Ligand binder design. Structure first.
Ligand SMILES: Cc1cc2nc3c(=O)[nH]c(=O)nc-3n(C[C@H](O)[C@H](O)[C@H](O)COP(=O)(O)OP(=O)(O)OC[C@H]3O[C@@H](n4cnc5c(N)ncnc54)[C@H](O)[C@@H]3O)c2cc1C
Ligand SMILES: N=C(Cc1cnc[nH]1)C(=O)O
Length: 381
């Protein structure tokens, strides 16, 4: 009984305009009519706007590391017109053993080196030379990856969205998917002012991917959102930290990285929560500050910024890009975990190819990617 606009027909409806939907949409948009439906007034209000903006190959499961490695070429050399400035800035990563676990440190070095030939094994004095605020008594060695990079996430994200629009796609904010139904051979999404129809529904809804499946009547993946908090604080007078690496503890108890002229800290937490607009917890922030003040000579007065975001995982820690079994046209782009920005070029290209029933492009297969490794079918016996 209330007015709605006539339905809009497309080839692919993408739910969510974060890095997952934007990257998938970007690679789809040259081939057909893309409509991206985003709940919020802005596309990057949830996880894509809350990251540490870093690129690190030796991080995550083997599938994650391949997706990340395979994304570098786009990031370093994107198409003409994609963006105005470089997407990556040099930022090596140093993983420091603060718990005296040489066997773990060696395992991570050998593992890392196998993918990153320039990775180095450092002794405690070498780690303290690189970040001189480290407490030598607390340091037992480190790994060092000279190939790490900071990512200009806003430029990357906006580049994907602009690409969609240049290919006559639509990116519609304030268009929460409220209902989803298979109607006359298409998926039909009701938003508050009108509905959208396409043969393909691309579920790129971040921590809400299983909620979208629940609207559609599609069996969910078992996605678990996990809260991670972070904060920005001023370095003490006299400390010039602008060229420090990203510093991470071996057991992921905290990390620390320069953010221009400030420092970004985090307790690197993973507290399981429901999908929601997540806020930082005081205990998260206090724990991160405590651990930084114990590992280093830094004293932290009060943060300039605090936030938290959701890193969402399925049971095996791997990303998901594939059609749902037994649910025609429903395509998952999910389980980005702590890796959705640094994997986005490979995930977007792969997902788009698979949506289109195409082979994975050579450069992706050469990095050891295949359809089965990405598929949600692997979560099932
Ligand atoms: C503290 C922290 C540090 C991190 N560090 C890094 C890092 O250094 N590098 C890295 O690669 N990753 C990092 N991550 C991970 C990265 O943030 C996520 O993997 C990535 O942002 C997930 O993108 P997404 O598109 O899946 O999710 P989101 O960006 O959350 O996008 C999903 C979108 O779906 C929309 N949506 C949900 N439901 C609906 C609906 N009903 N209708 C319409 N739209 C809907 C949401 O509003 C949202 O905009 C970090 C994350 C955190 C929190
Ligand atoms: N991905 C991160 C941080 C990161 C470190 N190096 C690259 N990324 C996270 O906190 O999920």
């Amino acid at each position: 009984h209330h007015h709605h606009h006539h339905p809009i027909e497309a080839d692919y409806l993408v739910i969510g305009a974060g890095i997952a939907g934007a990257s998938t949409g970007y690679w789809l948009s040259a081939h057909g009519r893309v409509v991206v439906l985003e709940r919020e007034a802005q596309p990057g209000y949830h996880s894509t706007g809350r990251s540490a903006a870093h690129y690190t190959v030796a991080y995550g499961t083997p599938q994650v590391r391949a997706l990340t490695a395979a994304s570098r070429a786009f990031f370093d050399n994107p198409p003409a017109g994609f963006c105005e400035h470089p997407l990556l800035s040099p930022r090596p990563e140093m993983v420091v053993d603060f718990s005296d676990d040489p066997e773990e440190l060696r395992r991570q070095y050998e593992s890392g080196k196998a993918l990153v030939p320039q990775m180095r094994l450092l002794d405690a004095e070498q780690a303290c030379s690189i970040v001189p605020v480290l407490r030598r008594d607390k340091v037992f060695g480190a790994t060092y990856d000279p190939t790490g990079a900071d990512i200009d996430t806003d430029a990357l994200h906006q580049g994907y969205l602009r690409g969609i629009r240049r290919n006559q796609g639509q990116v519609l904010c304030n268009h929460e998917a409220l209902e989803i139904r298979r109607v006359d051979g298409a998926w039909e999404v009701r938003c508050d002012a009108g509905s959208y129809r396409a043969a393909v529904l691309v579920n790129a809804a971040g921590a809400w991917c299983d909620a979208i499946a629940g609207l559609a009547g599609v069996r969910p993946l078992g996605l678990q959102p996990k809260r991670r908090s972070a904060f920005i604080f001023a370095p003490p007078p006299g400390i010039d930290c602008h060229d420090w690496p990203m510093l991470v503890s071996l057991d992921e108890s905290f990390y620390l990285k320069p953010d221009a002229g400030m420092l970004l800290g985090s307790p690197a937490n993973a507290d399981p929560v429901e999908a929601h607009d997540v806020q930082p917890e005081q205990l998260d922030i206090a724990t991160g500050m405590y651990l930084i003040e114990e590992a280093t000579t830094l004293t932290i007065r009060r943060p300039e910024h605090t936030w938290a975001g959701l890193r969402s995982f399925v049971a095996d820690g791997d990303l998901v890009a594939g059609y749902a079994a037994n649910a025609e046209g429903f395509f998952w782009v999910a389980a980005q975990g702590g890796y959705g920005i640094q994997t986005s070029a490979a995930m977007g290209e792969a997902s788009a190819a698979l949506i289109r029933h195409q082979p994975l492009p050579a450069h992706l297969r050469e990095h050891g990617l295949d359809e089965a490794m990405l598929s949600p079918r692997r979560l099932s016996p």
